């Protein structure tokens, strides 16, 4: 009962927090009987656009909007306008799109020093990329090594999409710890888990939670040695991780052959053109060391009454409009653009990182998680008087949308062109937030002795996960609740 | 074999990859960003590359509306919601709303129950995948099934195979025999076993545009307590508005083909076909939230925080969502009824033409009894090879769909193609006539046409051949240099 009531309450709170109601909220739950007018639609749409929301425009949201620049957005919009009806599955009908796509891939292959037989596909997103990589490896190991009970070895810090992959394609997952202070995968632990049913090694460049780049060289050595495909999740490093050297920022493992196709064990890399490529959402690229590989992810069904069906990825039908958007984005930004943006973003990251380490308050109370090199800075509490989640809620109350982590308890900022412009303000607000909690503790001690974010703390520590499970289930339901 | 293959592939590449003077191939990022005007210029160039003229209504079921007014609106929506990502509802509430509303509107269209739930997917493929996954997870959680099986009609969409391949399920193909080209209910029944986790039905099916016996499937589904999924991807809005338009509604008098039938647990609908939403916009419908839930992915233990996603994709395009939404609102019931009237009208007209026109009626035959937007016809004359007809129309600039079982061609009518039905009829007549003449000279004395090679390869003992051929195609799709 009680658990139930608590849950229901929590859900109700979520719904009350996400579902926007109140006078003015017209809920359109059935098709209009007569078509609205263009102006009508435009009006309503503006109305929607101006709903109250975390002001990403004010650079207060972590890694949600990477560029946001009107000029670019317009361009993307025009591209969309020109290729609105384009569907690449019909290259003979939409050749332009087909070209643009190919080119996008090419351009990315180059960024990561791909071999000449390098091949790649566009995917809707990093999730899809990862899925397809996994599938690829599975099919590979099946066709070649006749493997039937597939296994993949991932770091704990690895992106959940991998678990999704294993869940979907029926693979056994192995999570290796990334212990402090390095917060990098345990190579020995990886080695130990390698067995004949291992079909994929995974590495992160960097990883979502902490923004740490795993020991891709070491993983490559293992991969080469045991003849197992290495996949690099670079979704989040995107362009930024690549332009690091050009920007002058140290490139992860430069002196050990980098983190990309330069390393012979690296067989597949996933890159999100929509994160730091600044492409429209719905634009990622998966790279394979050779066509031979890529092929495993293809779906061909020749016996179909409707004709031979062939699809390179998950989707049959896709949006040429978005493809074109991605393309132009790349062309409009260009090497210079990316170097510049890199400079800014990484600069901001480094500045923040310094702030935490140096600022008299922060340096005493907080600590950086590992040694982040890219665009993601994760920090945790080094003072038992300051609960990190409390800090999170404190910043949230100040209008910040940062990312709360679990293992360990921490917060991360994924810096984007917007957030980079707000770094100082972030620093300020963080200082103030921290101070406040210190006073609270002081007041607690004075008194002798309400914690929010407990969902990630108390609930994070809760014995069963069923609780958080139901909580999320609600969230998701809410996402589609209109009535 | 190898040489033949390689040649074929080379022909494909030489037929899809535009080369030749002026074809600038950008294989690396420009060193300095291009200017807006430069980009616009290039983009126009790309847009005006030579291609099958869908604008002239010569492409089957690729562009459903294509109307400038709508496109502009969609474009504006995209412009306003370019950066929107629904996974952040607190950041992009509008999108979150619009989505929910879309789902609702569709749920209504198919007479969903009050506890009816639904998600948006990128497309019908994804819808189908998610339905299959849902069923699987259901049967696992509830009936502890470990070796899942699904029963589908032969005419069912390949995405089902993809689903089974992906999620490791056993697939059962049931025949759809002439003249009905509907699934064999008896054969379905016989295959039902404790490991059966999903029954499938088509409304209509892609190849022949036939609606399966959804009532019967519903009965079986209720009886054996197995989920029924209706693939409605291709019936989309048009099948929903058929009766309103005045055209007969499949199985009206037996409770229709949608949630009115108690056995119908899930329906997949493509807002991007006849909803006229931008590409990347489909909806999956479930009789109850409880059901829908099975397709959700929740990973709570993740160091980055509790991950939860409703479908395949984590990140998604709010721009597209908003576009789809507006499309609906801008078109409205009236609009859809009108478009239905036109499209179905055209289909029927074509169907009649084939049955009545002195030439065609003698040489061709409709496949089954189509009622929707897909009209499929085959050769009734051994002198006329359907694929040859296909190639003939192809030479006339038509992009129609060539089928295998049986050998046939289909037209999926869209606002464009509907406007060209007459011209299509004319060109078809002329095409047929030609092949008849050819056969005359043939018989008077005693080669290989492309489509024929497609048929020959499909008639070959092993599919490995065609497989490779397809692979090549796909590779081509990503060849830039």
Numbering used by the authors:
A (entry chain A): 85 to 533, 540 to 573
B (entry chain B): 87 to 532, 539 to 573
Show sentences the authors wrote.
Deacylation of Cer to sphingosine and subsequent phosphorylation by sphingosine kinase lead to the formation of sphingosine-1-phosphate (S1P), whose irreversible degradation by S1P lyase (SPL) terminates sphingolipid metabolism. The protein is a tight dimer and belongs to the Fold Type I family. The active site is formed by residues from both subunits and comprises an Y-shaped channel whose distal part is largely hydrophobic.
To confirm the soundness of our virtual screening campaign, we solved the crystal structures of unbound hSPL and AfuSPL at 1.8 Å and 3.5 Å resolution, respectively. Structural superposition with the human protein results in a RMSD of 0.82 Å (between 412 Cα pairs). Notably, the AfuSPL structure displays a structured N-terminal region, consisting of a long helix that is not observed in hSPL, although its presence in hSPL is predicted by AlfaFold50. This helix is positioned near the active site access cleft and, at least in the soluble construct, is much more flexible for the human protein compared to the fungal enzyme. Moreover, AfuSPL has an insertion of six residues in the C-terminal region that may also alter the dynamics of the substrate binding cleft. On the other hand, no significant differences are observed at the active site level, where all the residues likely involved in substrate binding are conserved. In particular, the N-terminus helix, that is structured in AfuSPL and disordered in hSPL, partially covers the access to the binding poket and provides additional hydrophobic residues to stabilise the binding of lipophilic compounds, and this may account for the higher interaction of AfuSPL with ANS. A clear explanation to these data is not currently available, but we could speculate that this is due to either the structured N-terminal helix in AfuSPL, which could increase binding affinity by partly closing the cleft and preventing ligand dissociation, or to the increased flexibility of the regions allowing the access to the active site in AfuSPL, which could favour the adaptation of the ligands to the active site cleft.
